[PDB]
Every structure is written in structure tokens, then in C-alpha cells.
Design a protein around this ligand. Structure first.
Ligand SMILES: CNC(=O)[C@H]1[C@H](C(=O)N[C@H](C(=O)N[C@@H](CC(N)=O)C(N)=O)C(C)C)[C@H]1c1ccc(OP(=O)(O)O)cc1
Length: 101
């Protein structure tokens, strides 16, 4: 197995922006522990010359979600959005960031 190159843990929202703005592919993303919602997570995605942010929401059942579809894990939420757009207004598919070993 191998660890997921998308979990950055505790990193400021603005830092996620600086990092993702340097990626070249739209969809480059990362999950970070929320700064406005301590104890939760946020998803930051590169799209054009901007970095969009999404709240990773939770329900009383412990599920994770962005919109209506609910997932049992962060991993499944992430993977689902590699083939279905994370945005309703735009077609944005998640793709791992390019990192040099
Ligand atoms: C300045 N405020 C924002 O960044 C708006 C961001 C937002 O609304 N994003 C759009 C959106 O419509 N999000 C939906 C879906 C979602 N799950 O975020 C929503 N607001 O419920 C998205 C299409 C770019 C919502 C946001 C606010 C905080 C946040 O966590 P954090 O950055 O850690 O403080 C993550 C996202």
C-alpha cells in the first residue's frame, strides 16, 4: 500500500492556496484540517488562476459529503470526485498534485 498524497493535515487555508496555485493541472487538490471549523476538514482545488475551497460536511451518522451524495469515508469522497465534478457550476475533477520525490 501507499499513503495518499492529498492529506496535508494542519496547513493554513492561504498556504494551501499558495501551494495549489503553483500546480499546473486544474483539479490538483488537497484535504486540510479546517481553519474556520476546527475538528473538521476542507478541500482546496486548483481551477484556472484560482483555488476553490469546499467544506467537508458531516451528519449525525458520521458520513462525509460536499453536496447531497454522502460517503462513509474521506477516501471514498475524494475518489468519487475524480470522475464526478466537485462543482455544480463547473466541471472540476480531482487529480493528485504533481510532487517531486
Ligand atoms: C470565503 N468562503 C469560502 O471559501 C466559501 C466556500 C464556498 O462556498 N465554496 C463553493 C461552494 O458552493 N461550496 C458549497 C459546497 C461545500 N461543501 O463547500 C457550500 N458552500 O456549501 C465552491 C463551489 C467553490 C465556503 C468555505 C468556507 C470555509 C471553508 O473552510 P475553511 O477554508 O477551512 O475555513 C471552506 C469553504
Amino acid at each position: 500500500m501507499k499513503p495518499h498524497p492529498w492529506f496535508f493535515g494542519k496547513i493554513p487555508r492561504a498556504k494551501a492556496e499558495e501551494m495549489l496555485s503553483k500546480q499546473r493541472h486544474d483539479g490538483a487538490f488537497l484535504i486540510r484540517e479546517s481553519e474556520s471549523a476546527p475538528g473538521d476538514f476542507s478541500l482546496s482545488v486548483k481551477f484556472g488562476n484560482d483555488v476553490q475551497h469546499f467544506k467537508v460536511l458531516r451528519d449525525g451518522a458520521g458520513k462525509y459529503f460536499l453536496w447531497v451524495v454522502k460517503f462513509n469515508s474521506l477516501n471514498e469522497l475524494v475518489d468519487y470526485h475524480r470522475s464526478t465534478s466537485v462543482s455544480r457550476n463547473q466541471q472540476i475533477f480531482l487529480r493528485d498534485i504533481e510532487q517531486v520525490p
